[PDB]
Short mmCIF file of C-alpha atoms in Angstrom, two decimals:
data_model
loop_
_atom_site.label_atom_id
_atom_site.label_comp_id
_atom_site.label_asym_id
_atom_site.label_seq_id
_atom_site.Cartn_x
_atom_site.Cartn_y
_atom_site.Cartn_z
CA UNK L 557 34.06 -10.55 14.80
CA UNK L 558 35.89 -7.03 15.48
CA UNK L 559 32.71 -5.14 16.93
CA UNK L 560 34.28 -1.88 17.71
CA UNK L 561 37.01 -1.68 15.74
CA UNK L 562 39.07 -4.45 13.02
CA UNK L 563 39.99 -2.75 9.63
CA UNK L 564 37.26 0.72 10.20
CA UNK L 565 35.83 -1.32 7.73
CA UNK L 566 33.82 -4.73 8.11
CA UNK L 567 31.55 -2.29 10.39
CA UNK L 568 29.59 -1.88 7.05
CA UNK L 569 29.19 -5.46 6.37
CA UNK L 570 27.30 -5.53 9.94
CA UNK L 571 24.87 -3.15 8.56
CA UNK L 572 24.79 -5.19 5.65
CA UNK L 573 22.01 -7.58 5.33
CA UNK L 574 20.12 -7.30 2.52
CA UNK L 575 18.27 -10.62 1.32
CA UNK L 576 14.56 -8.78 1.16
CA UNK L 577 11.77 -11.06 2.90
CA UNK L 578 8.90 -10.97 5.33
CA UNK L 579 10.04 -9.22 8.17
CA UNK L 580 8.60 -6.88 11.05
CA UNK L 581 10.85 -4.35 13.03
CA UNK L 582 14.09 -6.91 12.53
CA UNK L 583 15.37 -3.97 9.63
CA UNK L 584 14.23 -1.34 11.65
CA UNK L 585 15.88 -2.18 15.01
CA UNK L 586 18.94 -3.42 12.89
CA UNK L 587 19.05 -0.17 11.36
CA UNK L 588 18.81 1.78 14.61
CA UNK L 589 21.63 -0.64 15.65
CA UNK L 590 23.28 0.33 12.57
CA UNK L 591 22.69 3.96 13.12
CA UNK L 592 24.51 3.80 16.52
CA UNK L 593 27.45 2.11 14.47
CA UNK L 594 26.96 5.20 12.63
CA UNK L 595 27.38 7.18 15.84
CA UNK L 596 30.57 5.82 16.59
CA UNK L 597 31.13 6.53 12.58
CA UNK L 598 31.44 10.15 12.93
CA UNK L 599 27.89 10.45 14.34
CA UNK L 600 25.48 12.91 12.00
CA UNK L 601 27.44 11.60 9.10
CA UNK L 602 25.19 8.98 7.11
CA UNK L 603 22.82 9.04 10.23
CA UNK L 604 20.72 11.54 8.51
CA UNK L 605 20.24 9.35 5.03
CA UNK L 606 19.88 6.42 7.16
CA UNK L 607 17.25 7.77 9.03
CA UNK L 608 15.17 9.41 6.02
CA UNK L 609 16.21 6.43 4.18
CA UNK L 610 14.66 3.96 6.71
CA UNK L 611 11.88 6.62 7.62
CA UNK L 612 9.45 5.43 4.39
CA UNK L 613 8.89 1.95 4.38
CA UNK L 614 5.77 1.38 1.87
CA UNK L 615 2.69 3.74 3.27
CA UNK L 616 2.59 3.67 7.36
CA UNK L 617 1.00 0.08 7.98
CA UNK L 618 3.73 -0.79 10.28
CA UNK L 619 5.20 -0.11 14.10
CA UNK L 620 8.58 -0.58 13.18
CA UNK L 621 8.67 2.93 11.51
CA UNK L 622 7.74 5.10 14.19
CA UNK L 623 9.68 2.77 16.43
CA UNK L 624 12.97 4.02 14.35
CA UNK L 625 11.95 7.32 14.37
CA UNK L 626 11.10 7.41 17.89
CA UNK L 627 14.83 5.26 18.48
CA UNK L 628 16.58 8.44 16.80
CA UNK L 629 14.64 10.63 18.99
CA UNK L 630 16.25 8.92 21.91
CA UNK L 631 19.89 9.30 20.04
CA UNK L 632 18.43 12.95 19.56
CA UNK L 633 18.27 12.81 23.57
CA UNK L 634 21.70 11.47 23.80
CA UNK L 635 22.82 14.60 21.85
CA UNK L 636 22.81 16.89 24.83
CA UNK L 637 21.26 20.19 23.65
CA UNK L 638 17.75 20.05 22.67
CA UNK L 639 17.73 22.70 20.18
CA UNK L 640 18.29 20.64 16.89
CA UNK L 641 16.78 17.48 18.74
CA UNK L 642 13.37 19.60 19.40
CA UNK L 643 13.83 20.79 15.72
CA UNK L 644 14.21 17.53 13.99
CA UNK L 645 11.88 15.66 16.68
CA UNK L 646 9.34 17.76 16.13
CA UNK L 647 9.01 17.89 12.26
CA UNK L 648 9.80 14.06 12.57
CA UNK L 649 7.09 13.86 15.51
CA UNK L 650 4.68 15.72 13.43
CA UNK L 651 4.91 13.79 10.54
CA UNK L 652 2.50 10.99 11.58
CA UNK L 653 0.10 13.87 12.91
CA UNK L 654 -1.34 13.69 9.17
CA UNK L 655 -1.22 9.94 8.44
CA UNK L 656 -0.72 7.02 11.13
CA UNK L 657 -1.53 3.74 10.03
CA UNK L 658 -3.90 1.42 9.00
CA UNK L 659 -2.74 0.84 5.19
CA UNK L 660 -2.51 -2.95 4.45
CA UNK L 661 -1.31 -5.65 6.64
CA UNK L 662 -2.88 -8.11 9.57
CA UNK L 663 -3.50 -5.03 11.69
CA UNK L 664 -7.25 -4.47 11.56
CA UNK L 665 -6.64 -1.02 12.89
CA UNK L 666 -3.85 1.70 12.89
CA UNK L 667 -3.34 1.43 16.84
CA UNK L 668 -1.34 4.72 16.60
CA UNK L 669 -1.58 5.11 20.56
CA UNK L 670 1.15 3.58 21.30
CA UNK L 671 3.56 4.54 18.69
CA UNK L 672 2.23 8.10 18.21
CA UNK L 673 1.97 8.48 21.37
CA UNK L 674 5.48 7.42 22.08
CA UNK L 675 6.72 9.96 19.62
CA UNK L 676 4.26 13.18 20.82
CA UNK L 677 5.63 12.26 24.43
CA UNK L 678 9.47 11.82 23.30
CA UNK L 679 8.69 15.43 22.00
CA UNK L 680 7.00 17.28 24.22
CA UNK L 681 5.24 16.68 27.81
CA UNK L 682 7.70 14.03 29.09
CA UNK L 683 6.56 14.66 32.84
CA UNK L 684 10.55 13.77 33.91
CA UNK L 685 13.18 16.36 32.90
CA UNK L 686 12.80 17.67 29.67
CA UNK L 687 10.73 20.44 29.34
CA UNK L 688 9.42 23.04 26.44
CA UNK L 689 5.66 21.76 26.77
CA UNK L 690 3.22 24.28 25.40
CA UNK L 691 -0.12 24.64 27.11
CA UNK L 692 -1.63 23.15 23.97
CA UNK L 693 0.87 20.14 23.85
CA UNK L 694 -1.36 18.19 26.20
CA UNK L 695 -4.23 18.24 23.76
CA UNK L 696 -1.59 17.35 20.94
CA UNK L 697 -1.21 14.08 22.88
CA UNK L 698 -4.70 13.78 23.57
CA UNK L 699 -5.03 14.46 19.72
CA UNK L 700 -2.10 12.58 19.09
CA UNK L 701 -4.02 9.29 20.48
CA UNK L 702 -6.93 10.77 18.68
CA UNK L 703 -9.31 8.35 20.34
CA UNK L 704 -8.51 6.89 23.29
CA UNK L 705 -4.50 6.13 24.87
CA UNK L 706 -3.82 4.01 28.43
CA UNK L 707 0.00 3.78 28.02
CA UNK L 708 0.19 7.23 29.59
CA UNK L 709 -3.27 8.52 31.33
CA UNK L 710 -2.15 9.11 34.93
CA UNK L 711 0.80 10.41 33.66
CA UNK L 712 -0.84 12.16 31.04
CA UNK L 713 -3.86 13.71 33.19
CA UNK L 714 -0.70 14.86 35.81
CA UNK L 715 1.05 16.53 33.11
CA UNK L 716 -2.54 17.93 32.08
CA UNK L 717 -2.56 19.05 35.92
CA UNK L 718 0.96 20.68 35.74
CA UNK L 719 0.46 22.95 32.95
CA UNK L 720 -2.87 23.70 33.88
CA UNK L 721 -4.31 22.59 37.52
CA UNK L 722 -7.93 23.34 36.92
CA UNK L 723 -11.40 21.56 36.60
CA UNK L 724 -11.13 21.40 32.96
CA UNK L 725 -8.27 18.91 33.25
CA UNK L 726 -10.00 17.05 35.72
CA UNK L 727 -12.85 16.60 33.44
CA UNK L 728 -11.17 15.59 30.60
CA UNK L 729 -9.32 12.97 32.27
CA UNK L 730 -12.67 11.49 33.67
CA UNK L 731 -13.66 11.58 30.30
CA UNK L 732 -10.50 9.98 28.35
CA UNK L 733 -10.35 7.35 31.66
CA UNK L 734 -14.44 6.38 30.92
CA UNK L 735 -13.98 6.17 27.14
CA UNK L 736 -10.19 4.94 27.50
CA UNK L 737 -11.48 1.20 28.95
CA UNK L 738 -14.45 0.08 29.93
CA UNK L 739 -14.96 -0.87 33.74
CA UNK L 740 -12.55 0.40 36.68
CA UNK L 741 -9.17 -0.31 35.11
CA UNK L 742 -8.52 3.26 34.25
CA UNK L 743 -11.99 4.78 35.70
CA UNK L 744 -10.38 3.92 39.01
CA UNK L 745 -7.57 6.27 38.39
CA UNK L 746 -10.50 8.50 37.34
CA UNK L 747 -12.14 7.82 40.28
CA UNK L 748 -9.05 8.74 42.55
CA UNK L 749 -8.09 11.74 40.21
CA UNK L 750 -12.09 12.64 40.82
CA UNK L 751 -11.67 12.75 44.59
CA UNK L 752 -8.30 14.54 44.75
CA UNK L 753 -9.45 16.81 41.96
CA UNK L 754 -12.85 17.32 43.73
CA UNK L 755 -10.83 18.26 46.86
CA UNK L 756 -8.08 20.56 45.41
CA UNK L 757 -10.19 22.18 42.78
CA UNK L 758 -13.80 21.96 43.27
CA UNK L 759 -13.58 22.94 46.91
CA UNK L 760 -14.19 21.18 49.82
CA UNK L 761 -17.51 19.81 50.85
CA UNK L 762 -19.16 20.58 47.46
CA UNK L 763 -22.47 18.94 46.04
CA UNK L 764 -21.34 18.78 42.58
CA UNK L 765 -18.42 16.80 43.48
CA UNK L 766 -20.76 13.93 45.14
CA UNK L 767 -22.85 14.39 42.55
CA UNK L 768 -20.40 13.67 39.64
CA UNK L 769 -18.65 10.85 41.85
CA UNK L 770 -21.79 9.01 42.77
CA UNK L 771 -23.05 9.55 39.40
CA UNK L 772 -20.19 8.20 37.50
CA UNK L 773 -19.64 5.63 39.63
CA UNK L 774 -23.24 4.62 40.14
CA UNK L 775 -23.78 1.12 39.13
CA UNK L 776 -20.23 0.03 39.04
CA UNK L 777 -18.38 -3.54 39.09
CA UNK L 778 -17.03 -4.30 42.67
CA UNK L 779 -13.62 -2.52 41.81
CA UNK L 780 -10.56 -4.17 42.54
CA UNK L 781 -12.16 -6.00 45.77
CA UNK L 782 -14.85 -3.99 46.15
CA UNK L 783 -15.50 -0.54 47.33
CA UNK L 784 -18.92 1.14 46.80
CA UNK L 785 -19.10 3.46 49.74
CA UNK L 786 -15.68 4.33 51.58
CA UNK L 787 -14.79 7.10 49.44
CA UNK L 788 -18.26 8.80 48.85
CA UNK L 789 -20.01 7.19 52.66
CA UNK L 790 -16.86 8.82 54.57
CA UNK L 791 -16.56 12.15 52.10
CA UNK L 792 -20.57 12.46 52.87
CA UNK L 793 -20.19 11.87 56.85
CA UNK L 794 -17.07 14.16 57.10
CA UNK L 795 -19.35 16.89 54.99
CA UNK L 796 -20.80 17.88 57.94
CA UNK L 797 -24.50 16.45 57.32
CA UNK L 798 -25.55 14.08 59.70
CA UNK L 799 -28.85 13.18 57.65
CA UNK L 800 -27.35 12.08 54.21
CA UNK I 1309 -20.78 -13.78 -35.36
CA UNK I 1310 -20.53 -15.45 -38.89
CA UNK I 1311 -17.88 -12.72 -39.96
CA UNK I 1312 -16.24 -13.47 -36.35
CA UNK I 1313 -16.16 -17.25 -37.06
CA UNK I 1314 -14.21 -16.82 -40.27
CA UNK I 1315 -10.46 -15.90 -40.48
CA UNK I 1316 -11.32 -12.24 -41.77
CA UNK I 1317 -10.77 -9.75 -39.32
CA UNK I 1318 -10.94 -6.51 -41.57
CA UNK I 1319 -14.49 -7.18 -42.74
CA UNK I 1320 -15.91 -8.15 -39.40
CA UNK I 1321 -14.31 -5.02 -37.95
CA UNK I 1322 -16.01 -2.79 -40.39
CA UNK I 1323 -19.36 -4.84 -40.08
CA UNK I 1324 -18.83 -4.11 -36.36
CA UNK I 1325 -18.16 -0.43 -36.78
CA UNK I 1326 -21.09 -0.11 -39.04
CA UNK I 1327 -23.65 -1.81 -36.88
CA UNK I 1328 -22.35 0.71 -33.83
CA UNK I 1329 -22.68 3.56 -35.80
CA UNK I 1330 -26.28 2.66 -37.53
CA UNK I 1331 -27.45 1.15 -33.93
CA UNK I 1332 -26.29 3.36 -31.33
CA UNK I 1333 -29.15 2.32 -28.87
CA UNK I 1334 -28.01 -1.47 -29.20
CA UNK I 1335 -26.15 -3.12 -26.34
CA UNK I 1336 -25.84 -6.40 -27.76
CA UNK I 1337 -23.46 -5.19 -30.84
CA UNK I 1338 -21.16 -2.96 -28.30
CA UNK I 1339 -20.90 -6.15 -26.24
CA UNK I 1340 -20.15 -8.61 -29.10
CA UNK I 1341 -17.50 -5.64 -30.09
CA UNK I 1342 -16.08 -5.82 -26.50
CA UNK I 1343 -15.83 -9.44 -26.48
CA UNK I 1344 -14.06 -9.20 -29.84
CA UNK I 1345 -11.82 -6.74 -28.51
CA UNK I 1346 -11.17 -8.84 -25.69
CA UNK I 1347 -10.12 -11.45 -27.71
CA UNK I 1348 -7.77 -9.30 -30.03
CA UNK I 1349 -5.06 -7.62 -28.69
CA UNK I 1350 -4.90 -4.73 -26.13
CA UNK I 1351 -4.72 -1.86 -28.43
CA UNK I 1352 -6.08 1.87 -28.25
CA UNK I 1353 -8.82 0.79 -30.59
CA UNK I 1354 -10.71 -1.01 -27.87
CA UNK I 1355 -10.44 1.95 -25.63
CA UNK I 1356 -11.83 4.30 -28.29
CA UNK I 1357 -14.66 1.93 -28.65
CA UNK I 1358 -15.38 1.74 -25.40
CA UNK I 1359 -15.13 5.88 -25.43
CA UNK I 1360 -17.79 5.79 -28.47
CA UNK I 1361 -19.52 3.50 -26.57
CA UNK I 1362 -19.71 5.76 -22.86
CA UNK I 1363 -20.34 9.29 -24.95
CA UNK I 1364 -23.37 7.43 -26.76
CA UNK I 1365 -25.01 7.85 -22.58
CA UNK I 1366 -25.12 4.19 -21.47
CA UNK I 1367 -26.19 2.94 -18.21
CA UNK I 1368 -25.05 1.76 -15.41
CA UNK I 1369 -24.41 -1.85 -16.54
CA UNK I 1370 -21.68 -0.88 -19.28
CA UNK I 1371 -20.24 1.91 -16.98
CA UNK I 1372 -19.48 -1.03 -14.27
CA UNK I 1373 -18.29 -3.40 -17.21
CA UNK I 1374 -15.79 -0.50 -18.49
CA UNK I 1375 -14.42 0.08 -14.66
CA UNK I 1376 -14.09 -3.80 -14.55
CA UNK I 1377 -12.15 -3.67 -17.73
CA UNK I 1378 -10.30 -1.17 -16.95
CA UNK I 1379 -9.46 -2.32 -13.07
CA UNK I 1380 -8.78 -5.94 -14.82
CA UNK I 1381 -5.86 -4.09 -17.13
CA UNK I 1382 -3.69 -2.93 -14.49
CA UNK I 1383 -4.99 0.94 -15.05
CA UNK I 1384 -4.94 3.37 -11.99
CA UNK I 1385 -5.11 6.74 -13.76
CA UNK I 1386 -7.19 5.60 -16.47
CA UNK I 1387 -9.63 4.35 -14.30
CA UNK I 1388 -9.66 7.45 -12.15
CA UNK I 1389 -9.79 9.72 -15.11
CA UNK I 1390 -12.76 7.82 -16.67
CA UNK I 1391 -14.51 7.52 -13.14
CA UNK I 1392 -15.00 11.41 -13.37
CA UNK I 1393 -17.72 11.61 -15.52
CA UNK I 1394 -19.66 8.39 -14.15
CA UNK I 1395 -20.84 10.31 -10.90
CA UNK I 1396 -21.83 13.32 -12.83
CA UNK I 1397 -24.54 11.21 -14.78
CA UNK I 1398 -26.03 8.51 -12.58
CA UNK I 1399 -26.16 10.22 -8.62
CA UNK I 1400 -27.76 7.29 -7.38
CA UNK I 1401 -26.56 5.98 -3.83
CA UNK I 1402 -25.00 2.86 -5.65
CA UNK I 1403 -22.77 5.18 -7.62
CA UNK I 1404 -21.74 7.46 -4.94
CA UNK I 1405 -20.69 5.24 -2.20
CA UNK I 1406 -18.82 3.19 -4.87
CA UNK I 1407 -17.13 6.70 -6.35
CA UNK I 1408 -14.12 6.08 -3.44
CA UNK I 1409 -12.98 2.95 -4.88
CA UNK I 1410 -9.31 4.12 -4.83
CA UNK I 1411 -9.21 3.40 -0.77
CA UNK I 1412 -9.83 -0.17 -1.80
CA UNK I 1413 -6.20 0.00 -3.86
CA UNK I 1414 -3.61 2.21 -2.31
CA UNK I 1415 -5.88 3.75 0.41
CA UNK I 1416 -5.47 7.04 -1.13
CA UNK I 1417 -5.88 9.38 1.63
CA UNK I 1418 -6.27 12.72 -0.24
CA UNK I 1419 -8.50 11.58 -2.62
CA UNK I 1420 -10.54 9.63 0.00
CA UNK I 1421 -10.35 13.21 1.59
CA UNK I 1422 -11.88 14.83 -1.56
CA UNK I 1423 -14.04 11.84 -2.37
CA UNK I 1424 -15.69 12.55 1.70
CA UNK I 1425 -15.98 16.38 0.72
CA UNK I 1426 -17.30 15.88 -2.42
CA UNK I 1427 -20.13 13.47 -0.80
CA UNK I 1428 -20.48 15.75 2.17
CA UNK I 1429 -20.86 19.00 -0.55
CA UNK I 1430 -23.24 17.07 -2.83
CA UNK I 1431 -27.15 16.67 -2.91
CA UNK I 1432 -28.52 15.70 0.25
CA UNK I 1433 -27.83 17.65 2.74
CA UNK I 1434 -30.86 17.05 4.66
CA UNK I 1435 -31.18 13.24 4.38
CA UNK I 1436 -28.19 11.68 2.44
CA UNK I 1437 -30.20 9.04 1.13
CA UNK I 1438 -29.34 6.87 4.75
CA UNK I 1439 -26.16 5.59 2.67
CA UNK I 1440 -23.15 7.91 2.85
CA UNK I 1441 -23.18 8.05 6.64
CA UNK I 1442 -22.54 4.47 7.30
CA UNK I 1443 -20.14 4.13 4.52
CA UNK I 1444 -18.40 6.95 5.81
CA UNK I 1445 -18.23 5.45 9.65
CA UNK I 1446 -17.14 2.04 8.23
CA UNK I 1447 -14.45 4.22 6.25
CA UNK I 1448 -13.56 5.97 9.66
CA UNK I 1449 -13.57 2.43 11.54
CA UNK I 1450 -11.36 1.25 9.14
CA UNK I 1451 -8.93 3.85 9.16
CA UNK I 1452 -7.50 6.09 12.18
CA UNK I 1453 -10.09 7.91 14.21
CA UNK I 1454 -9.64 11.08 13.00
CA UNK I 1455 -13.53 12.04 12.40
CA UNK I 1456 -15.14 8.98 13.64
CA UNK I 1457 -17.15 10.47 16.44
CA UNK I 1458 -17.76 14.14 14.72
CA UNK I 1459 -19.60 12.82 12.03
CA UNK I 1460 -21.50 9.81 13.83
CA UNK I 1461 -23.20 12.14 16.28
CA UNK I 1462 -22.13 16.17 15.73
CA UNK I 1463 -23.33 15.69 12.02
CA UNK I 1464 -27.15 14.99 12.81
CA UNK I 1465 -28.21 18.29 11.02
CA UNK I 1466 -28.91 15.83 7.48
CA UNK I 1467 -31.13 12.99 9.84
CA UNK I 1468 -34.37 12.06 9.48
CA UNK I 1469 -36.55 12.83 12.59
CA UNK I 1470 -34.99 9.87 14.58
CA UNK I 1471 -31.14 10.66 14.14
CA UNK I 1472 -30.79 6.76 13.22
CA UNK I 1473 -32.17 3.84 11.74
CA UNK I 1474 -34.43 1.10 13.93
CA UNK I 1475 -32.15 -1.32 13.60
CA UNK I 1476 -28.70 0.61 13.01
CA UNK I 1477 -28.72 2.58 16.24
CA UNK I 1478 -27.42 -0.01 18.71
CA UNK I 1479 -25.12 -1.66 15.86
CA UNK I 1480 -23.35 1.92 15.46
CA UNK I 1481 -23.22 2.52 19.13
CA UNK I 1482 -21.35 -0.78 19.50
CA UNK I 1483 -19.17 -0.37 16.47
CA UNK I 1484 -18.18 3.31 17.62
CA UNK I 1485 -17.70 2.01 21.33
CA UNK I 1486 -15.59 -1.02 20.67
CA UNK I 1487 -13.05 0.77 18.19
#
């Protein structure tokens, strides 16, 4: 009722909910929408107090916290110049680095890959438009997952290849893809990046490339349908050796 | 018991204090005084009697009873302050694994890091009594993967000749793989 304007008053009643009870994500999403109503309220006025008030709920143990902070990072992407958005998104993105999740609740583990990797990806190394990604920012995302992440593997290895383009990023992408998920889920992409990275980094017709490609895929399950051969068999037949 | 069965509480407390001062090595009189204090109010005299019993070099069964009485009285700072001299007297493997009890209440991240640094800087730099590593791996698996792969694989300088146990190598491998 009178959403864009009525008295320029009842919008506060729209932001007024209260009734404390058990909820997950509703006060954070409605608080981000109330932060958009604060953006139509004069933008930064009352917005930082809402982000700081809704930034701390209990101790971690929620996916709505980092989702609301990341939503404030998207509103910071709507803020045009990336100076202040990169400073506030850099500190607010650096806060989960100390403590992530898994305090109390129904979540057995922390699961900081999604939210933490989303905040770290919004802070730097977006692989689309925004720049200002340091050479250590890729290791800051891989350290943001802190164990293994699959949300941005192909794109993460592509960003590490954009910042470096060497064999170290290829081996780190193979280890992150193997430890990422069992079976050729991310390991198939690690095999494609192992052949392309084997040709464009390790050199063409290299023995170590066939040794690693045959070593990681050796036993294997039948991939998508099956491939045990054509990559390594065709690569060995095209290497110039009619014996092997 | 005859003094506590009657309505006299001053003479009963005066008999209990004399029995505690004459028989300091006895534990049944201290248990009876603790039961009489639990039957009475929560005044500071019960805490003073508990401190006088703990200052007489008691065993671990009295320290565990005092820690349970402090935890059942909604005490957070008083339980953490009284737990500093408990690990300095009995450095057992059951007492070192129970010193990091603040993680089970409010998850105490700085306190858990300090307890892990104290457990790594304590005695047992070459064997660790085969009990601190499993608890550290469980605390790392319950929390985020900050130092879960480091203490399980790169911290093998304190292992005893086989880098793992007989029935706990494949179990630790499955716990580190699927987490």
